[PDB]
Amino acid sequence: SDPNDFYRDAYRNENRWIDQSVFTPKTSKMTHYDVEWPKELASRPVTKKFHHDKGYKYDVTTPYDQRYNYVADRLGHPEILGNPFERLMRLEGDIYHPNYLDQPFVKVPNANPNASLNFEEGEVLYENTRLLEWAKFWNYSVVVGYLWCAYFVPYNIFFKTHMPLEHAYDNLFFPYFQHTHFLWDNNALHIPTVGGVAIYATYIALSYINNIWKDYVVRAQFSKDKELLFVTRVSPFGTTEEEVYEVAHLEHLPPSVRSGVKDLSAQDADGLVDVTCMSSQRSLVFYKGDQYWNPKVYNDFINQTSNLWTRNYTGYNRLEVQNSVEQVKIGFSH
Amino acid sequence: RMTNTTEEAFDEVSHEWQALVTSNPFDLNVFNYLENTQTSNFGTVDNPLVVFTSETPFRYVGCTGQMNEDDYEGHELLFFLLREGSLQRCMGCGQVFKLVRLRNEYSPEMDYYLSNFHPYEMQEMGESDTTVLMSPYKYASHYEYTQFETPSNMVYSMVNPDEHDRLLVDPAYRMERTKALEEKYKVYTSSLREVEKQFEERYGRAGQINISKVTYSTLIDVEKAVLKMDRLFRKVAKFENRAFIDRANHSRREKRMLERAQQRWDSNYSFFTGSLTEEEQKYRDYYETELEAY
Amino acid sequence: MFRWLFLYWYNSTDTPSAIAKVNLWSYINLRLFKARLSSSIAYYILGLNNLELKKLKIFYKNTYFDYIYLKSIPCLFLIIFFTNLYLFL
Amino acid sequence: TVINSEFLTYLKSNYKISFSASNIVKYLSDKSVNNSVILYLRKNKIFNKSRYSRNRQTYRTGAYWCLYVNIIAVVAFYFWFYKFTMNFGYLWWLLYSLILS
Amino acid sequence: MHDTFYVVAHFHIMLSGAAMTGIFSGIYYYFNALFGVKYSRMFGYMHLIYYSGGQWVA
Amino acid sequence: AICLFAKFWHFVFIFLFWVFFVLRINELGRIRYPLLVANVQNFIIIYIMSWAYMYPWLKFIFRKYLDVPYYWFYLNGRELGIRVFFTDLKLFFYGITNRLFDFNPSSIKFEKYPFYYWINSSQLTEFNQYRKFVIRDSIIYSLNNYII
Amino acid sequence: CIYQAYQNPLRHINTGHNPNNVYEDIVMLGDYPVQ
Amino acid sequence: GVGSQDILILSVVFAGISTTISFTNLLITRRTLAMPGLRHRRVLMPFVTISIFLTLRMLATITPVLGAAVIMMAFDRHWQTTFFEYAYGGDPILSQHLFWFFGHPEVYVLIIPTFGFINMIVPHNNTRRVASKHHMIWAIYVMAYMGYLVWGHHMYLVGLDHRSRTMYSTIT
Amino acid sequence: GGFANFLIPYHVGSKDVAYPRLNSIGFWIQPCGYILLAKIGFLRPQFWRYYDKTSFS
Amino acid sequence: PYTKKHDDWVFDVTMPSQNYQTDLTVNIHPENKKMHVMKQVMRQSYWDAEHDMAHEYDY
Amino acid sequence: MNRFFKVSSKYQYYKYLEQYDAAFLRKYQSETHWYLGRRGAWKNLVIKYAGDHISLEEEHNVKYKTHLSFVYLSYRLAWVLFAYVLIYNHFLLGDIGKTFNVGEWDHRLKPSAERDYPTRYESLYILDRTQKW
Amino acid sequence: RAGPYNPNRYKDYYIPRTLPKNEEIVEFVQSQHSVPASPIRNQRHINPVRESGPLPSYDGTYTMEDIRAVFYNTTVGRDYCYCQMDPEEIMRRVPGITRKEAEFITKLGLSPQEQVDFAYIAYNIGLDIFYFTNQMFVARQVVTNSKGEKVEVLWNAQCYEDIAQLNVGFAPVLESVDYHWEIFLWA
Amino acid sequence: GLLLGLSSIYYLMYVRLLPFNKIIFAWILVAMFLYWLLSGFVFFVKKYQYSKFTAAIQRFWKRTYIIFWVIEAGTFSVFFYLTLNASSEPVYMYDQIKIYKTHLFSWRWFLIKLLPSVSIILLGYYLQLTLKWNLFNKQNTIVLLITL
Amino acid sequence: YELFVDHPDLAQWTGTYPKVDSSHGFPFYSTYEMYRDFQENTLNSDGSFAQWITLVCGIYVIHVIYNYMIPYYWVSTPLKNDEFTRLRMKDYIASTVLEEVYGISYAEWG
Ligand SMILES: [Cu+2]
Ligand SMILES: [Mg+2]
Ligand SMILES: [Zn+2]
Ligand SMILES: [Zn+2]
């Protein structure tokens, strides 16, 4: 590796005429790229109606009937059909634009439940009725606290006195004075700002409470074929909201950080276990405890959710590393 | 911090990731930083200054002559609109610049000018964890710092656009393609290993390691410690995840562990000789049948 | 992994065109992580048969602080002597 | 992986290694390969020839915001500094056009 | 002469003369690219004559 | 006051940005690291703007250091900056050690008498108080008569 | 787009984005795609 | 009285906002959107463009000061903060000094682009290289730097300290 | 406006402006100030004319 | 873009196109040039709005 | 190595999970691929296609775009106001009293202003307001 | 008016549609280590030659001193110069010049000294003196590189640092007629 | 939210006896401006939702944020510079109290007053560290607390 | 050379021209445009006139700094001991700048 010597034998001014000879290497032929790639390119369909300024002769239209029909999910997606209220509002959404729905290479998923699916109900797997009462209490407390600390106190503190709070003058080194609301913001931009802020804050608080409470599972019932589990969770108005989940969607898996297993909620005997419906990337937080679950079907639900939590999550031992993966047999057939 | 391209990149992120993964010249020319470009030689008749353009008929270019040490510019800034097809000589400089029309392919011609483009920077790629370091002493010096780690186990493969759609809508096709790609990667790795072995046999080692005996002993000890720590961590993880890994005999193992620890932590103190701890003893008690083999 | 950039481009068997033969590009072959200079002074001189790359390394930079303490004694003693003389004079 | 001696001999007789492999994957190990994830990337035609992405050609929202800012500024300045409000009744044709629009 | 017609003349000749004259020069220097047509020689000369004289006259 | 009003307007802007980010995140269902970092940066900027009332505190040390004339001008001829730093470090170490493992001055005091701290001038006070403190002394005496 | 059908309705959910007199929404005002 | 003064103050505020917007839009491109070869060697760019960039930086300098002065004047006019009343602490000299700190740099930035325009016009007409491009660029930059120190020149009769007057005259 | 917008794309050799939306906003916004600063000489809070007998109204 | 050539090297107006470099019997008289057709300058292009209206139209 | 045990559902497309090692699934459906594992990305493709087209620049929320009535009203009002402002400021500055109306509001603590009259209905009524403190 | 067209609505084949065989991959890897790879571009000049041809001799057919006599006699009148020289003399002045070229040179309208200088320049640099100077290429030249190929160089027009002032054209004309709204349409 | 906002607007209008026509005009103009800004931001978000997030785009967004912060901080810097060297009457006779009018506010309450912003910053940092390992529904509580 | 090899951006901020020897024929891994403004706007470079004028102005400014403001910031309140002396010293430190008085030496010229 004497680099100078390498240079002394690498770039010689004599071989200049042959030095920059870009040569297509005569390497081994690869049928995938040297045979299959050309012929497939050679079979490219052609059209005579390319856009004069923007089209291309090989830009052929793909038939929608030739697009891959949806078989990924056995449940409908009403977001494709939208909501009548939106129609009644004539709202312009990105999930209802027909051009956006006109996928060129694939066929869009069906917006209605698949005809194979039966909507009949079966038997309840788990139930927790007092959760509704607890959630209602929490939501009512949140609403009452927001109203009190935000409106009732501000209403009196701003419109029912002339002396400001001690927090108003602790930082200002100015002579004391009284405050009145009849000589402030003559061009009342503060009124619309306060109204908009209050409306948006109330909406955000409601939506956040609904999202927080919407992950837990309040009532569950596996279907007659146990394919579509009907579950009622907590609704935003404190009521119940019913949905369905496909059997293949739910699972229980080790966390992404294997060191966090000991700090998992399900590690406790009276904890919580999350079934993750992978189809909608949804979560159903069942109470990890024996009292709430139904004895008859639990094992099957346990057998239907425990698929990735295997020995591989811990690794392979010294005697097991020999069988880590499937052996690749190459060259024994030529 | 590195984006999951299989679910995110559609057109622009697709081009950027493809450039960062394959270094295709046009692709590189797609994302070359405007701050600086690789400096080439002066344009001669035999050695034209190769100015690349991604399949564009014309490109504006300025002529500065032969730059000197004293002055960064040699000649007056004369701008010309070089067109693809033939070399053009800036008259004031006599500078022969040749336009190159880059076409999206994998031909050896693309390999000819592979060294004419500076490699793309990976610092700005991916998501960032800090808006901007508001340090006036580091305003234009260091790139943004990140709090998360960047995985390096990724192996990227290009896909035909419509075919990619078929992967996005058909999970079974995605699984089959992933298995086939893993098999292909394994085959390629085995072939590379065989090639390296053959090259070593036909040529020999490049040399001996210029390392110290103390460092060599420390490295051997470090390897042994790494193996031991890996075994210990594996045992700890196996014990911790006992409930979820196995569910049928979990009740029996838990009951046996509780009974054994009851007569070990109550009514009797446990004098532990060696590195065996209470957690290790409980783990050994739980999967008692497991440790009986290996 | 290369030290002299020329050698890096000497005979590259991992060209992207070659990489096109299998369509499998691991992140471990990123160009930005391929090669880097040695940060030492390097001058290309006209050798007897071809150019030779001479390597100038001015100062080794692995000094232990003890050595720094080893050399500082004479200067400190001279400073002390000068201060004492200027005080006495 | 596993490789057969017959295929190895056939390849060696057909191809003799005359150069080393520059791919960094040559330095990879079997466990490291087993700890790898395959990724997919759609390849299609390229249209935006810049480091930055392609941008639209119209901002009617921006134009309208600028016009509204100008109108609001004019009205507020007239009503505050000059204490004057526009008597919109004189331009009957303009008012009719605005109403019809 | 603070705050007087001398200062007024200084300010005007520095701004109205030099800056506007340079603006007109750049307009004529880039008349084609901005307008797409060649300038009108006679009327342009008349403008350059009357504008230059008026500044000094005022 | 003008600075405080500007700070209030900036705080309003930052709150509006945070609210918009929250609404968009709720609409989307997945968080963006750029958005999170931008919100964190806005909050940091607001927090930096929060400590603005300390102008008198900042003025003290700077005006004290600004009053010194040149040492070579021979007004005081004393330049003991680093000397003060080192000696004060040692003295503060000694003072902390004394406050830790020595006799601590007592803080218990009377807390239930009316105007017990309102002390008037007397022979025990030398009557060298403020020249106009006679009114305060008389009021204190009258209040003591009331509370007696 | 008055008397000249430049836009196509099948690709537009809300026809009428520009002032025109030769277009009508495929989704009628009393239409409602139901499940 | 209420009227033209307030209207002018509001117009000045609006102009300052617009100038800030324009300056951001211009300077952001020059720092980021420069071509591959025009990253740092400003001598390559035309004289008019160089003057444009320099005047944009100069405007970005004085615009916040002008805006703050306008805000203070508006507060005095409409809230009576005595920001200019000699009775309880204020001084018209402060307002005059602020206006002059916005004053002379404004004229200096205004007259700058015309020189670049003339320099660009002359070189093409004569088919010759400029006399001293680097020297002219450095002189323009030095004149811009010096314009920030001629504030007292336009207020010589305000009666500042004789040292300040002498310094202002020497800088002018 | 004119010189910068015309030349920076050409002279600086940059694609459009750094913030084209901001450039358009400023171009459309200048008219408000232009009009406001030019109406002060003819419009005053004292609207009535010298011969206007404002006492009657 | 325009691609019509409209001007090339034209002689035989004041300089004869024949080769009389060393023709002592031939004398060139530039003052006796024959009349030619006046070539008006290229008038500015007029937009074919309709086609342009189609070219700049947006779907 | 742990191989998938069995599948119990009805749709045979689910049987594809029976030929993959759990880690592989964890590799292709969890950690990095958790947000996309075992989900048909119809929504992703739809969103990308929608974003690709040159749609109306006016938007209200991430879910739905801006209201057509609001857009039309804002555009018409802006155009009419700009036209009126231009006409008045460039042509109708002669008799401002003929072309302008005087009105303003005073602070509620302060007494009602003399010019604080209802616009366009002055010839019918007179207004006054009680102060507060 | 053509209807809307979506380039992403048509399938494209920029990559093979099938995966390669394991044995084929092994063979390709074996071959890839057996043959040398094509070199990448190296910007090192091999053997530079005088770009404007050989430098003028101290004495000979056309010494540099004669060139030194040209700059002082440079002029640009409003008409062509009928001072046409005898082509043979020009041919005598520049050994290797084509006679017809001199006839073309003598028809240019320059004074005989300038004509001889232009003829010498064309003979030394191989300039094609018959190509018209237009907006696309200001001049055309033919050369023979170190690879021996007979290549053509189109010396194009330039600008005085003002691209806006540069007449960007695609025709062999002199007028500036085209006004492209986008300076960089392809960004 | 709509009920509360409408009730607040009506109560404020009734309290101020606002003129309906002028109030409606001002409110419409403000709504137009705000809606336009929000629509621009939403349009940018929707465009950057997919196939638009380049490293150039990220850098441009960071640069835009930094420029906005710098432009905002400029006026406050001028105000602080004016306030530090604030004007007053002559200290010789006119304004003698300025020597004793330090107006130094005690820091003993500043920390207690400012603690909420620090708590919010700490919660933001925790959320930024937690986003890589948490779920969208799991992190909603942090967002709610930050909003409150 | 080590700095330029390590952090090229800093080298650009330092205006250090590319020190890598590109005689090998292969282009460098990281090229950049130099910003020699710091190396130009100096008294020993093309900015000699600008730097000289700036230095002269700063010397004029430094004289104003050392003799007009800082002494004014020294004494602020009425003093019991030699207040008149301190005020006289402060004022004479500023009221006797030669630029205000040196004319009379050569007065017949004017
Ligand atoms: Cu001035
Ligand atoms: Mg004056
Ligand atoms: Zn040149
Ligand atoms: Zn740095």
- Name the residue with tokens 């032929």: A29
How far apart CA E18 and CA E13 sit, in angstroms, is: 7
Name every chain H residue with its beta carbon within 8 A of the beta carbon of I26.
18, 21-22, 25
Helix (H) / strand (E) element for L92: namely: helix L87-93
User: Tokens for D41?
Assistant: 């990337």
DSSP-derived secondary structure letter, C10: T
**H14 contacts chain D (CB < 8 A):** yes
All residues at 6 or more sequence positions from B283 whose CB lies less than 8 Å from its CB, including other chains:
B235, B236, B238, B239
- Name the residue with tokens 């009126």: K84
DSSP-derived secondary structure letter, L114: H
The total of other beta-carbon atoms located within 10 Å of residue A156's CB is 10
**Helix/strand/coil (H/E/C) assignment for every residue in A189-225:** CHHHHHHHHHHHHHHHHHHHHHHHHCCECCEEEECCC
The amino acid sitting at C2 is F
Residue pair M56/L187 in contact by the 8 Å Cβ criterion: no
How far apart CA H118 and CA B172 sit, in angstroms, is: 71
Name every chain C residue with its beta carbon within 8 A of the beta carbon of B120.
31-32
Is N7 part of any known ligand binding site? yes
Helix (H) / strand (E) element for B58: namely: strand B58-63
- Name the residue with tokens 């591989």: A312
The total of other beta-carbon atoms located within 10 Å of residue G12's CB is 20
Number of alpha carbons in the 13 Å side-chain half-sphere of residue B65? 13
Judge N/G contact: 3 or more CB pairs < 8 A.
no
The total of other beta-carbon atoms located within 10 Å of residue A261's CB is 23
Residue pair A102/K58 in contact by the 8 Å Cβ criterion: no
| Proximal ligand: closest to the CA of B75 | 3
Q: What is the CA radius of gyration of chain N?
A: 26
DSSP symbols for N85-104: HHHHHHHHHHHT-GGGTGGG
How far apart CA N86 and CA N75 sit, in angstroms, is: 8
User: Tokens for F142?
Assistant: 């009258």
Residue D90's nearest CA partner among K94, B122, H13, A167 is K94
User: Tokens for A56?
Assistant: 């291309």
Residue pair A144/A153 in contact by the 8 Å Cβ criterion: no
How far apart CA K8 and CA M82 sit, in angstroms, is: 77
Residues lining ion ligand 3 (Cβ < 5 A) are: B 63, 65, 75, 90, 92-93
- CA of G20: how far to CAs of G6, K56, K59, in Å? 10, 16, 21
Q: Specify the long-range contacts of residues A3-10, CB closer than 8 Å, at least 24 apart.
A: A3/C3, A3/C4, A3/C7, A3/C53, A4/C47, A4/C52, A4/C53, A6/C4, A6/C7, A6/C10, A7/C6, A7/C50, A7/C51, A7/C52, A7/C53, A7/N24, A8/C47, A8/C49, A8/C50, A8/C52, A10/C6, A10/C7, A10/C10
E-strand ranges in chain L read: 139-144, 150-155, 159-160
The b/e string for H84-120 (b: 16+ C-beta within 10 A; e otherwise) is beeeebbeeebbbbbbbbbbbbbbbbbbbbbbbbbbb
How far apart CA B33 and CA H123 sit, in angstroms, is: 33
Residue pair L183/I9 in contact by the 8 Å Cβ criterion: yes
Cα-to-centroid distance, N9 and ligand 4 (Å)? 8
User: Tokens for I27?
Assistant: 């171009």
Residue pair B102/B55 in contact by the 8 Å Cβ criterion: yes
Task: Tell me the three state secondary structure of residue L62.
Answer: coil
Chain L: residues touching A (Cβ < 8 Å): 2-3, 5-11, 13, 15-28, 30-32, 35-39, 41-42, 44, 46-47, 146-147
**C87 contacts chain B (CB < 8 A):** no
Number of alpha carbons in the 13 Å side-chain half-sphere of residue B235? 22
Q: What is the CA radius of gyration of chain B?
A: 31
Bin F25: left if φ > 0, else alpha if -120 < ψ < 50, else beta: alpha
**L128 contacts chain J (CB < 8 A):** no
- CA of I50: how far to CAs of B202, F69, I47, I53, in Å? 111, 65, 10, 8
Residue pair B155/B6 in contact by the 8 Å Cβ criterion: no
- Name the residue with tokens 């004229």: H107
Residue B122's nearest CA partner among H105, C27, H106 is C27
The amino acid sitting at B137 is Y
- State residue C47 phi and psi, 5-degree precision: -75, 180
Residue pair N36/B72 in contact by the 8 Å Cβ criterion: yes
Give chain M's length: 148
How far apart CA B68 and CA B217 sit, in angstroms, is: 54
DSSP symbols for D19-42: S----GGGG--HHHHHT-EEEEEE
Residue pair B171/K38 in contact by the 8 Å Cβ criterion: yes
How far apart CA K113 and CA B22 sit, in angstroms, is: 75
Cα-to-centroid distance, H160 and ligand 2 (Å)? 13
| Proximal ligand: closest to the CA of E11 | 1
Find residue A220's DSSP bridge partners. A231
| Proximal ligand: closest to the CA of H159 | 2
- State residue A323 phi and psi, 5-degree precision: -110, 40
Residue A258's nearest CA partner among B241, B60, J59 is B241
How far apart CA L98 and CA L91 sit, in angstroms, is: 8
Task: Tell me the three state secondary structure of residue N52.
Answer: helix
How far apart CA H74 and CA H68 sit, in angstroms, is: 10
User: Residue F123 class from Cβ within 10 Å (0-12 exposed, 13-18 middle, 19+ buried)?
Assistant: exposed
The amino acid sitting at A225 is D
**M32 contacts chain K (CB < 8 A):** yes
Residue pair F80/F109 in contact by the 8 Å Cβ criterion: no
User: Residue A171 class from Cβ within 10 Å (0-12 exposed, 13-18 middle, 19+ buried)?
Assistant: middle
Q: Name which of H40, H167, H170 is nearest N33 (Cβ-Cβ).
A: H40
Residue pair N1/N21 in contact by the 8 Å Cβ criterion: no
Pairing of β B95-101 and β B88-90: antiparallel
How far apart CA N110 and CA N103 sit, in angstroms, is: 9
Task: Tell me the three state secondary structure of residue H130.
Answer: coil
**D47 contacts chain L (CB < 8 A):** yes
How far apart CA M100 and CA M98 sit, in angstroms, is: 5
Residue pair M95/M88 in contact by the 8 Å Cβ criterion: yes
Residue M16's nearest CA partner among D79, K132, K115, A164 is K132
All residues at 6 or more sequence positions from A279 whose CB lies less than 8 Å from its CB, including other chains:
A73, A75, A245, A246, A248, A249, K38, K39
How far apart CA B157 and CA C34 sit, in angstroms, is: 20
Residue pair H51/H116 in contact by the 8 Å Cβ criterion: yes
Residue pair K7/K14 in contact by the 8 Å Cβ criterion: yes
CA distance E33 to chain H (A): 14
User: Tokens for F147?
Assistant: 């509370």
Residue pair E13/E7 in contact by the 8 Å Cβ criterion: no
How far apart CA D14 and CA D16 sit, in angstroms, is: 7
Task: Tell me the three state secondary structure of residue A279.
Answer: coil
- CA of D77: how far to CAs of A214, C22, I43, K79, M73, in Å? 51, 70, 12, 19, 27
Residue pair C23/L15 in contact by the 8 Å Cβ criterion: yes
Residue pair J33/J14 in contact by the 8 Å Cβ criterion: yes
Query: Largest Cα–Cα distance in chain K?
Result: 94
Query: Would you report the helix, strand and coil content of chain E in percent, each value rounded to 5?
Result: 80, 0, 20
How far apart CA B285 and CA C12 sit, in angstroms, is: 57
Residue pair B245/A310 in contact by the 8 Å Cβ criterion: yes
Pairing of β B154-159 and β C25-26: antiparallel
Q: Name which of B118, B140, B141 is nearest N30 (Cβ-Cβ).
A: B118
Residues lining ion ligand 2 (Cβ < 5 A) are: E 2-3; H 157
DSSP-derived secondary structure letter, E16: I
DSSP-derived secondary structure letter, K21: B
User: Residue A290 class from Cβ within 10 Å (0-12 exposed, 13-18 middle, 19+ buried)?
Assistant: exposed
User: Residue M116 class from Cβ within 10 Å (0-12 exposed, 13-18 middle, 19+ buried)?
Assistant: exposed
Residue pair L96/L90 in contact by the 8 Å Cβ criterion: no
User: Tokens for A26?
Assistant: 């005569």
How far apart CA B5 and CA B127 sit, in angstroms, is: 12
Binding residues of E: 2-3, 10, 12, 16, 50, 55
User: Taking the mean position of all CA atoms in its chain, how far away is CA A212?
Assistant: 15
How far apart CA B38 and CA B54 sit, in angstroms, is: 16
User: Tokens for H169?
Assistant: 């005259």
Find residue B95's DSSP bridge partners. B90
Angle between helices K68-91 and M20-47 (to 10 degrees): 120
Interface with chain F: mutation pick from A167, A184, A200, highest number of F CBs within 10 Å: A200
Helix (H) / strand (E) element for A276: namely: strand A271-277
Residue pair C8/C18 in contact by the 8 Å Cβ criterion: no
Cα-to-centroid distance, H24 and ligand 1 (Å)? 25
User: Tokens for A298?
Assistant: 């639990």
Number of alpha carbons in the 13 Å side-chain half-sphere of residue L57? 6
